[PDB]
Amino acid sequence: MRIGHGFDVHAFGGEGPIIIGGVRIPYEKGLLAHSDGDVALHALTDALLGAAALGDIGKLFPDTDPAFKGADSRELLREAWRRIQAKGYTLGNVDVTIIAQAPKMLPHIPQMRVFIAEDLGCHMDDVNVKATTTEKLGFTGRGEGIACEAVALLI
Amino acid sequence: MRIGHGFDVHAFGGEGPIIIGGVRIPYEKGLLAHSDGDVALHALTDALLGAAALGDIGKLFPDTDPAFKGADSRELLREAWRRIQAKGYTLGNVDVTIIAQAPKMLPHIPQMRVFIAEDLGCHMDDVNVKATTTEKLGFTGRGEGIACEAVALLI
Amino acid sequence: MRIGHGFDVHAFGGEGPIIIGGVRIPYEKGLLAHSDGDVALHALTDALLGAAALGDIGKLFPDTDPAFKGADSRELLREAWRRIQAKGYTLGNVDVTIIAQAPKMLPHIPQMRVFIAEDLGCHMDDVNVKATTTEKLGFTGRGEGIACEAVALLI
Ligand SMILES: C[C@](O)(CO)[C@H](O)COP(=O)(O)OP(=O)(O)OC[C@H]1O[C@@H](n2ccc(N)nc2=O)[C@H](O)[C@@H]1O
Ligand SMILES: C[C@](O)(CO)[C@H](O)COP(=O)(O)OP(=O)(O)OC[C@H]1O[C@@H](n2ccc(N)nc2=O)[C@H](O)[C@@H]1O
Ligand SMILES: C[C@](O)(CO)[C@H](O)COP(=O)(O)OP(=O)(O)OC[C@H]1O[C@@H](n2ccc(N)nc2=O)[C@H](O)[C@@H]1O
Ligand SMILES: [Zn+2]
Numbered sequence: 148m149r150i151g152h153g154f155d156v157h158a159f160g161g162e163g164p165i166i167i168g169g170v171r172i173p174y175e176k177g178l179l180a181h182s183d184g185d186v187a188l189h190a191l192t193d194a195l196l197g198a199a200a201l202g203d204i205g206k207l208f209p210d211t212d213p214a215f216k217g218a219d220s221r222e223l224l225r226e227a228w229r230r231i232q233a234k235g236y237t238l239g240n241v242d243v244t245i246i247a248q249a250p251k252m253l254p255h256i257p258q259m260r261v262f263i264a265e266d267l268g269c270h271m272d273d274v275n276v277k278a279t280t281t282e283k284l285g286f287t288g289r290g291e292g293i294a295c296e297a298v299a300l301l302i
Numbered sequence: 303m304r305i306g307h308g309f310d311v312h313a314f315g316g317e318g319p320i321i322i323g324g325v326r327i328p329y330e331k332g333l334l335a336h337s338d339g340d341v342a343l344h345a346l347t348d349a350l351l352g353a354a355a356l357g358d359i360g361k362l363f364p365d366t367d368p369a370f371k372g373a374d375s376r377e378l379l380r381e382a383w384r385r386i387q388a389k390g391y392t393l394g395n396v397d398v399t400i401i402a403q404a405p406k407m408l409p410h411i412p413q414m415r416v417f418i419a420e421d422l423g424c425h426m427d428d429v430n431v432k433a434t435t436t437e438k439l440g441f442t443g444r445g446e447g448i449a450c451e452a453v454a455l456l457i
Numbered sequence: 458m459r460i461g462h463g464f465d466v467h468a469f470g471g472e473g474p475i476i477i478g479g480v481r482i483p484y485e486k487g488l489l490a491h492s493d494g495d496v497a498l499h500a501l502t503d504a505l506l507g508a509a510a511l512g513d514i515g516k517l518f519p520d521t522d523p524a525f526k527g528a529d530s531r532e533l534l535r536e537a538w539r540r541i542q543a544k545g546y547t548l549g550n551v552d553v554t555i556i557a558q559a560p561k562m563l564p565h566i567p568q569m570r571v572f573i574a575e576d577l578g579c580h581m582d583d584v585n586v587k588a589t590t591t592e593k594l595g596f597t598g599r600g601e602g603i604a605c606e607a608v609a610l611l612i
């Protein structure tokens with residue numbers, strides 16, 4: 148069994164909605180990013196690649212490579228996972244922690260878990276997502292951006 | 303074995319003391335919160351619920367539900383743990399990282415570990431707590447609030 | 458198997474280069490610290506000590522003790538590891554996440570992994586390091602300092 152850790156942040160910018168964990172969440176402002184800026188799935192991906200010792204998302208899919216411009220983060224997630232499985236690993240479980248003052252992630256989590264468990268090919272039971280605010284403190288508390296952390300256990 | 307991750311932050315406000323990890327730590331200012339604002343135990347709780355795939359603290363015990371107003375975070379911890387055990391899990395071990403510029407958590411950690419190991423019904427050996435400052439950087443470095451991270455391994 | 462979590466931050470200050478993960482990385486400004494301010498290895502160390510239930514780096518090697526002034530963080534890492542092994546543990550694997558807007562950690566990671574795997578006496582395969590920016594947000598985004606997180610699994 149191997150453990151992995153990921154972390155990511157994206158700044159708000161433009162018009163909503165935002166895409167977090169695959170779910171299109173309505174919000175006043177949107178997220179600035181090369182990809183779809185899915186903070187939750189980037190953080191999750193790095194955690195998996197991390198536990199597989201494959202580096203990180205920016206190693207496999209370059210921030211600068213133009214093909215990833217607007218790229219569906221679930222696409223990157225599924226590839227990183229394909230590569231991880233090929234290296235001989237199987238999913239233990241993952242846990243995601245979305246750090247955002249707003250929007251309200253709560254109602255979108257079940258669906259977030261459906262997408263992720265799909266992409267990973269596991270039961271939703273091996274996938275957990277939660278959220279927290281930083282009580283108006285920080286760039287997150289000020290609504291400047293969203294951050295997200297994640298851990299994964301591979302077998 | 304399952305892994306979990308939690309994270310929490312609370313802003314300073316009012317008169318001291320603060321309650322972290324169950325310990326009443328004396329400090330100039332106190333912590334603003336619905337509950338007792340025990341950042342360390344909230345972070346710990348989410349990590350456990352996270353590894354159990356039960357969501358998070360705000361799911362089980364609503365921030366808005368008035369009964370949790372002033373609620374002893376060890377109470378929430380023990381319940382979340384009861385529910386976790388019922389789902390068939392047993393504690394592997396937990397590790398907490400308190401991120402605060404001040405107060406000095408160090409002298410209070412042994413006692414923090416006694417409370418937590420009690421609430422979890424394990425040996426202190428399966429419970430670790432540590433602290434760190436952010437070197438005067440950030441909302442924590444500026445003494446605006448305390449943050450805390452935690453991980454847990456369930457069996 | 459035991460899990461551990463570490464976190465650390467150091468403010469920029471003075472002239473470069475910086476030392477991260479053992480690697481001397483060239484940068485305009487340098488890092489302020491008692492030790493060599495190796496954020497990555499401090500974070501890694503706490504994760505290992507954390508999983509071993511030995512506390513944290515500041516417990517074993519006091520910030521105030523003058524001998525650690527300028528201390529090679531790999532030295533502290535190796536000791537904490539010696540002590541950890543003595544307590545009967547063996548390395549499962551570690552994963553580090555350097556949170557910095559700049560400098561570019563990417564090219565230095567292979568070498569970072571060589572040093573760490575050496576100090577831990579494992580194969581590089583049990584050691585992963587990755588990096589991320591906070592998209593110009595926060596003290597990190599503002600180039601005020603570097604932060605780093607890490608997780609470890611002991612056996
Ligand atoms: C999915 C993509 O957006 C591409 O489409 C990227 O792969 C990742 O984008 P991102 O989440 O915005 O992450 P970024 O903060 O821009 O950084 C990605 C890459 O830069 C490197 N990096 C980052 C920060 C830093 N101080 N030094 C670095 O070397 C890391 O190795 C990482 O692989
Ligand atoms: C223990 C309690 O205080 C109740 O007494 C709460 O359960 C938790 O309080 P807290 O530590 O201050 O955490 P909070 O930051 O206020 O958020 C709690 C809940 O809000 C949800 N949440 C939070 C932030 C966000 N952007 N979207 C969300 O949906 C999460 O699902 C979480 O369950
Ligand atoms: C390696 C050394 O620099 C010594 O040479 C230190 O061991 C660690 O230095 P550091 O990474 O800069 O970490 P610091 O943020 O200065 O804090 C170290 C110690 O202070 C304690 N601490 C920290 C913050 C806080 N609010 N309360 C505390 O009690 C912790 O128990 C930790 O062990
Ligand atoms: Zn991203």
Ligand SMILES: [Zn+2]
Binds near residue numbers: 310339340
């Ligand atoms: Zn809280």
Ligand SMILES: [Zn+2]
Binds near residue numbers: 466467494499
């Ligand atoms: Zn340090």
